[PDB]
């Protein structure tokens, strides 16, 4: 047995990962060398700032050369833990790059961008509903709910197209209450209820 001393070498490699705004997450990084390379992480080729830098900030530098966030941070005027990852090794001899990680960030809001409204409508005419959910990523898919059920267009004259909802040759037992929910991979949000309103002829040339 001996001693000896050795450029950097990288055993594991960060992987790409999705994670949600707000929860905590690792960048998996180990390295070899003689030292003891100084761990140094990049994002979109800048250096990450952590706890050894400001130790207020909410990345730690784990010793095991792990990148670790206290929670996800990502809101409208400011996202600055999304992006491209790569961590790198040093001592004097030399140094180790590793792969890409990719860093990507699930979110949805709670601001419903448009409600649906009560509407007012005569029977066998159609009536339509409108809503667009609050911003999300991946973006919310719409469906919607009549009466506390989950709605669905097996049923015919009920169309789910983009922001709208349509429903052919109105009867009576259409009149309900109506909610629009936006949903992604983060969870699901609910619109306010809208009141759709059927009404014969006569009375609604009285309502309208
Ligand atoms: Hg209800
Ligand atoms: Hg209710």
């Known amino acids: 047995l001996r001693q000896e001393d050795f450029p950097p070498r990288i055993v594991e490699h960060p992987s790409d990962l999705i994670v949600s705004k707000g929860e905590p997450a690792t960048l998996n990084c180990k390295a070899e060398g003689r030292?003891?390379?100084?761990?140094?992480?990049?994002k979109g080729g800048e250096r990450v700032e952590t706890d050894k830098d400001d130790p207020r900030?909410?990345?730690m530098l784990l010793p095991s050369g792990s990148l670790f966030f206290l929670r996800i941070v990502h809101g409208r005027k400011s996202r600055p833990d999304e992006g491209v990852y790569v961590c790198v090794a040093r001592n004097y001899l030399g140094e180790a790059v590793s792969h890409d990680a990719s860093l990507e960030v699930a979110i949805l809001r709670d601001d419903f961008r448009q409600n649906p409204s009560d509407v007012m409508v005569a029977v066998g005419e159609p009536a339509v509903m409108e809503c667009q959910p609050p911003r999300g990523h991946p973006e919310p898919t719409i469906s919607w709910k009549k009466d506390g059920s989950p709605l669905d267009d097996k049923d015919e004259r009920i169309t789910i197209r983009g922001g709208k909802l349509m429903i052919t040759y109105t009867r009576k037992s259409d009149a309900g209450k109506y909610v629009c929910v936006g949903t992604n991979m983060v969870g699901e949000r609910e619109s306010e209820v809208a009141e759709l309103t059927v009404l014969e002829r006569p009375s609604f040339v009285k309502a309208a």
Do not use: G, L, V
Request: neutral net charge; charged residues 20%.
């Open 35 to 42: 030292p003891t390379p100084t761990i140094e992480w990049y």
């Open 57 to 59: 900030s909410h990345r």
